[PDB]
Amino acid sequence: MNLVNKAQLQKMAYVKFRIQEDEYVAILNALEEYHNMSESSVVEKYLKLKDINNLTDNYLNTYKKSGRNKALKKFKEYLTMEVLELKNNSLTPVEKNLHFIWIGGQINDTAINYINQWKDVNSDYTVKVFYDSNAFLINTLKKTIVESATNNTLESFRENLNDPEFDYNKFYRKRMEIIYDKQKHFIDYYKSQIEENPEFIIDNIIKTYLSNEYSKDLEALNKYIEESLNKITANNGNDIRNLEKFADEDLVRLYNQELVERWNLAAASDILRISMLKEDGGVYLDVDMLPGIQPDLFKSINKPDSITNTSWEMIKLEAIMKYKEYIPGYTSKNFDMLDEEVQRSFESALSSKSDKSEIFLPLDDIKVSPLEVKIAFANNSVINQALISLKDSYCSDLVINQIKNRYKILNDNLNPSINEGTDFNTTMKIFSDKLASISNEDNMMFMIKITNYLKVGFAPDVRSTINLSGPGVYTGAYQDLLMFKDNSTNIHLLEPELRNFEFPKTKISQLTEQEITSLWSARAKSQFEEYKKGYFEGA
Ligand SMILES: O=c1ccn([C@@H]2O[C@H](COP(=O)(O)OP(=O)(O)O)[C@@H](O)[C@H]2O)c(=O)[nH]1
Ligand SMILES: O[C@H]1[C@H](O)[C@@H](O)CN2CC[C@H](O)[C@H]12
Ligand SMILES: [Ca+2]
Ligand SMILES: [Ca+2]
Numbered sequence: 001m002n003l004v005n006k007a008q009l010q011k012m013a014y015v016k017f018r019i020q021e022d023e024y025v026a027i028l029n030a031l032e033e034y035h036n037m038s039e040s041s042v043v044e045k046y047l048k049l050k051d052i053n054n055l056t057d058n059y060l061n062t063y064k065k066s067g068r069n070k071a072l073k074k075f076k077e078y079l080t081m082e083v084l085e086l087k088n089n090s091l092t093p094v095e096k097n098l099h100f101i102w103i104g105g106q107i108n109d110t111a112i113n114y115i116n117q118w119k120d121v122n123s124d125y126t127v128k129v130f131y132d133s134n135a136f137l138i139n140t141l142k143k144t145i146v147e148s149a150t151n152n153t154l155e156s157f158r159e160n161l162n163d164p165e166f167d168y169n170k171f172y173r174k175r176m177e178i179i180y181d182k183q184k185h186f187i188d189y190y191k192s193q194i195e196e197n198p199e200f201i202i203d204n205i206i207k208t209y210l211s212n213e214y215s216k217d218l219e220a221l222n223k224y225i226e227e228s229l230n231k232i233t234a235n236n237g238n239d240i241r242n243l244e245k246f247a248d249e250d251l252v253r254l255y256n257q258e259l260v261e262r263w264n265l266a267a268a269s270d271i272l273r274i275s276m277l278k279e280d281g282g283v284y285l286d287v288d289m290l291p292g293i294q295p296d297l298f299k300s301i302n303k304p305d306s307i308t309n310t311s312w313e314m315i316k317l318e319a320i321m322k323y324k325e326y327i328p329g330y331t332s333k334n335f336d337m338l339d340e341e342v343q344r345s346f347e348s349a350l351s352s353k354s355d356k357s358e359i360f361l362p363l364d365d366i367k368v369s370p371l372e373v374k375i376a377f378a379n380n381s382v383i384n385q386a387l388i389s390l391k392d393s394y395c396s397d398l399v400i401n402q403i404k405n406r407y408k409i410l411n412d413n414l415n416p417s418i419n420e421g422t423d424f425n426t427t428m429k430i431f432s433d434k435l436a437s438i439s440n441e442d443n444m445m446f447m448i449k450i451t452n453y454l455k456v457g458f459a460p461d462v463r464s465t466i467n468l469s470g471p472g473v474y475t476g477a478y479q480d481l482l483m484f485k486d487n488s489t490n491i492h493l494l495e496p497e498l499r500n501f502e503f504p505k506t507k508i509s510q511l512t513e514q515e516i517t518s519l520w521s522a523r524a525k526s527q528f529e530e531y532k533k534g535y536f537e538g539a
């Protein structure tokens with residue numbers, strides 16, 4: 001898997017009596033100078049491979065019938081192989097920063113209890129729980145608007161409950177039309193306030209608006225802010241509103257779009273996490289992840305043949321929490337179904353262990369290449385719930401570029417659509433038609449997945465987020481990397497290629513109570529039925 005010589009390339013691409021074209025010399029010259037760059041940095045080496053790939057298909061484009069072409073297509077696959085070799089040979093320990101994010105409301109104790117597990121076992125990591133001191137009321141604002149929209153939609157359904165098809169589908173359709181109006185009424189208010197007074201603070205804009213439009217109590221909202229601030233402060237809180245240099249101005253603008261306009265705290269955290277990893281370096285984790293387990297801990301308890309690998313991983317964390325009680329309240333529903341004898345196998349192994357680092361596996365030195373961002377996998381697909389990146393890595397810039405290029409397309413078409421539209425439905429049709437008019441083979445799936453952006457958080461089965469700030473931006477970056485592109489949207493990378501970037505498996509437990517619970521946000525008919533029930537169950 002060493003990269004072919006200039007001389008070896010001449011052998012592959014040989015055509016008897018054929019003139020050496022300028023475009024072909026160019027490739028050979030360039031490949032020679034690559035092999036002369038052993039002292040160069042890995043990024044520099046990667047950039048040279050990249051210049052070489054571009055020279056190659058300049059030849060392939062200029063001479064489409066050439067007999068060199070079969071060999072030159074092979075060579076391009078060899079260049080891609082060479083990226084992996086550089087990557088595997090350029091590993092170095094990440095900065096020992098451990099990042100979490102909680103924005104738009106008060107951090108729960110459940111989040112704090114999981115975070116502490118990582119804190120206790122990683123003394124040599126700096127734990128930073130990122131928050132936004134301007135924005136403790138995002139969830140309050142959203143919940144208020146949504147509540148108001150739900151209640152209005154039920155009043156329009158009051159005489160049509162028992163029949164025929166005033167059902168969950170119609171509910172969400174009509175409620176969303178109301179949400180849109182209420183949400184745009186806020187955004188317009190916020191936008192005008194920010195024009196008038198650009199020093200103005202988000203939470204202050206929000207309390208004024210809730211106070212005036214939704215009769216909310218100023219005192220109560222002020223109190224909530226104080227409690228939220230006090231709570232994160234006592235828990236390694238890092239205010240993003242202190243930090244100076246991290247702020248790419250375009251990314252900042254996307255962060256506040258997601259935070260203040262769209263109320264999508266997941267997307268805002270998607271944007272924030274990669275930005276902090278580029279600026280700080282380290283390991284990013286969602287607050288629902290737990291440390292890996294020491295491999296040897298339960299190594300001698302054989303899994304009952306009937307139980308799945310997934311259930312068994314789940315059972316192991318539950319055994320830890322039953323007998324050590326590190327997170328109080330942690331479920332034991334699965335663990336309690338095992339035969340008495342197996343429960344005691346777990347109990348005994350947990351008996352002889354004194355400290356938490358004999359139970360959980362500390363991160364210690366994690367090695368990573370400047371060319372990559374490591375990522376967690378769930379179900380054969382990447383998931384950005386855990387990430388690893390050196391400060392200022394090449395691949396962190398690929399991810400950030402993907403986010404910006406995607407949002408650009410979203411905004412350039414969505415902003416005019418919002419401006420021309422008397423309502424949700426007219427805006428949507430306008431937006432969809434605009435997307436249709438510029439769609440092609442490469443961006444068609446992306447265009448399809450971002451069409452329902454305005455419904456994100458308010459309706460079921462929406463996948464816009466994944467394809468703007470989530471998992472899709474990572475597969476796009478990895479394809480950019482391997483294929484020497486900067487625009488990947490149509491993905492041909494398979495799982496085994498994507499596995500080259502997986503987060504070290506022993507160093508994370510993804511199958512926690514909170515995450516499994518969060519995997520259930522499948523359709524909630526129940527919600528439309530529970531909202532329904534909350535109209536006979538009162539005074
Ligand atoms: O109110 C919220 C909700 C989510 N998040 C961030 O979004 C991450 C992922 O959210 P969640 O696990 O609920 O999303 P899901 O995994 O279901 O896509 C969390 O760890 C937080 O960093 C946040 O800051 N505030
Ligand atoms: O914030 C992330 C979360 O960290 C991951 O589990 C992937 N989720 C998919 C949708 C959104 O991107 C969200
Ligand atoms: Ca009072
Ligand atoms: Ca730093």
Ligand SMILES: [Ca+2]
Nearest residue numbers: 286288515518
């Ligand atoms: Ca989750």
